[PDB]
Amino acid sequence: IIGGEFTTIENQPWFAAIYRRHRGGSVTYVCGGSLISPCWVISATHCFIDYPKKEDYIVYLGRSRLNSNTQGEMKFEVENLILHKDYSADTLAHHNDIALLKIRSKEGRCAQPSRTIQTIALPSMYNDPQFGTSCEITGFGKEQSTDYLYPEQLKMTVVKLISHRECQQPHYYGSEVTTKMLCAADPQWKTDSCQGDSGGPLVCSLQGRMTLTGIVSWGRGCALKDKPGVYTRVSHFLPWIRSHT
Numbered sequence: 001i002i003g004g005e006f007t008t009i010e011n012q013p014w015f016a017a018i019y020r021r022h023r024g025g026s027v028t029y030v031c032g033g034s035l036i037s038p039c040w041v042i043s044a045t046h047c048f049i050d051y052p053k054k055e056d057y058i059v060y061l062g063r064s065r066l067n068s069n070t071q072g073e074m075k076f077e078v079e080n081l082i083l084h085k086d087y088s089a090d091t092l093a094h095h096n097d098i099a100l101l102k103i104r105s106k107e108g109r110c111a112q113p114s115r116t117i118q119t120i121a122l123p124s125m126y127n128d129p130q131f132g133t134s135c136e137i138t139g140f141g142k143e144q145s146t147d148y149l150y151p152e153q154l155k156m157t158v159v160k161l162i163s164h165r166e167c168q169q170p171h172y173y174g175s176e177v178t179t180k181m182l183c184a185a186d187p188q189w190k191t192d193s194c195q196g197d198s199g200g201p202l203v204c205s206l207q208g209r210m211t212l213t214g215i216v217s218w219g220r221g222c223a224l225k226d227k228p229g230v231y232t233r234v235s236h237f238l239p240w241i242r243s244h245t
């Protein structure tokens with residue numbers, strides 16, 4: 001997250017931190033996700049496509065920090081790793097950049113909800129906010145594009161929905177963007193998601209309800225003029241989400 005502000009897990013209690021085991025026992029951060037039900041986290045397929053084996057991954061919930069334990073957190077193995085059959089990688093774009101992780105603990109359990117651990121609602125079918133709507137994004141990704149390190153503390157910021165007609169322009173992303181994608185950005189290009197934020201939530205207030213409108217997917221740079229952040233448009237995948245769960 002370029003710009004924005006620091007936060008803790010209580011503000012975004014559905015945020016999931018996804019890590020990978022290494023040969024030689026290193027554990028590195030991979031991607032954010034969102035708890036949509038006690039046993040299901042949702043995320044981006046591109047996060048996992050190079051290491052598509054479930055035993056390599058660990059999911060944490062209720063965790064506000066990258067390399068220290070947060071009081072109250074729950075740790076899971078991935079019982080099930082579901083990548084979208086129609087995934088494709090463009091030069092920038094990712095199509096169908098959506099994945100599901102089934103989580104179960106060493107003791108064999110799913111998430112118990114708490115002050116630090118809650119679910120996020122999914123949108124109603126094909127129902128998105130108007131462009132110009134402010135939504136919020138969360139993740140452990142870089143604070144600047146040049147940074148080598150990821151922040152140790154979870155961050156969030158605000159970006160505004162951009163119309164497809166507008167994202168569709170050349171000047172912008174041209175045809176790279178599709179109707180199964182959304183674009184969002186700061187009017188000044190002052191704040192954005194960046195590397196490390198992929199798979200995390202884009203949450204919008206919809207009918208007085210906090211709703212998972214998008215999943216951080218791609219962009220050209222972070223926080224640059226005419227290069228919004230691109231998000232998997234969740235309201236176009238509900239049957240996929242419903243079937244595989």
Ligand SMILES: COc1ncc(-c2nc(C(=O)NC(=N)N)c(N)nc2N)c(OC)n1
Nearest residue numbers: 193194195198218219220221222228229230
């Ligand atoms: C050298 O150009 C370049 N720079 C950054 C990314 C980049 N962007 C994002 C992202 O989400 N950006 C955004 N929302 N604005 C991401 N999660 N990860 C990445 N590595 C990239 O993509 C290959 N290319």
